[PDB]
C-alpha cells in the first residue's frame, strides 16, 4: 500500500490509474481482513446430498 501510494504521485496518468487499480484490491483485502492466500483452495467444500439428490 505504501509503495502504491508513492507510485500514485507520478505525472503519468496511466501509471496513476494502474496504481489506483492495484490499490483498490489491496485496500479491499486490508479492510475486510481476508487473507489473499485464501483465494487458493486447500479443502474443497462438498454440498449437502439433499441439494444434489
Amino acid at each position: 500500500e505504501k509503495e502504491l501510494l508513492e507510485e500514485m504521485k507520478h505525472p503519468s496518468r496511466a501509471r496513476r490509474a494502474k496504481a489506483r487499480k492495484r490499490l483498490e484490491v489491496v485496500r479491499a483485502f486490508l479492510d475486510s481482513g481476508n487473507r489473499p492466500e485464501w483465494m487458493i483452495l486447500e479443502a474443497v467444500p462438498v454440498l449437502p446430498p439433499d441439494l444434489r439428490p
Binding site: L41, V44, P45, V46, L47, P48, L51
Partner: peptide, 8 residues
C-alpha cells in the same frame, strides 16, 4: 446459502 458455501 448452502450453494454459496459450496463455492468457498
Amino acid at each position: 446459502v448452502k450453494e454459496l458455501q459450496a463455492l468457498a
